[PDB]
Amino acid sequence: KTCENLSDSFKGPCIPDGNCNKHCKEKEHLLSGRCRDDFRCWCTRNC
């Protein structure tokens, strides 16, 4: 199973390659991440 939670402080425009993933993957070492138009990013982790 996996859960989604708001990143720590992910800002700036997202890319089609994936910038929210490498972030939460290099920091929180999570599974992946995704950005939104609400200036908020969600990271997926095991739960």
Q: Of the candidates 41, 38, 29, which has an alpha carbon nearest to the alpha carbon of residue 5?
A: 41
- Please give the backbone phi and psi of residue 43, each rounded to the nearest 5 degrees, phi first: -110, 135
CB 20 within 8 A of CB 30: no
**Domain holding 5: CATH number?**
3.30.30.10
How far apart are alpha carbons 1 and 22 in whole angstroms?
20
How far apart are alpha carbons 21 and 12 in whole angstroms?
14
What are the structure tokens assigned to 31, written together? 């599974």
Helices (H) and strands (E) in the chain, counts: 1, 3
Range of the domain at 42: 1-47
Positive or negative, the Cα torsion across 46, 43, 4, 6? positive
Domain count, the chain: 1
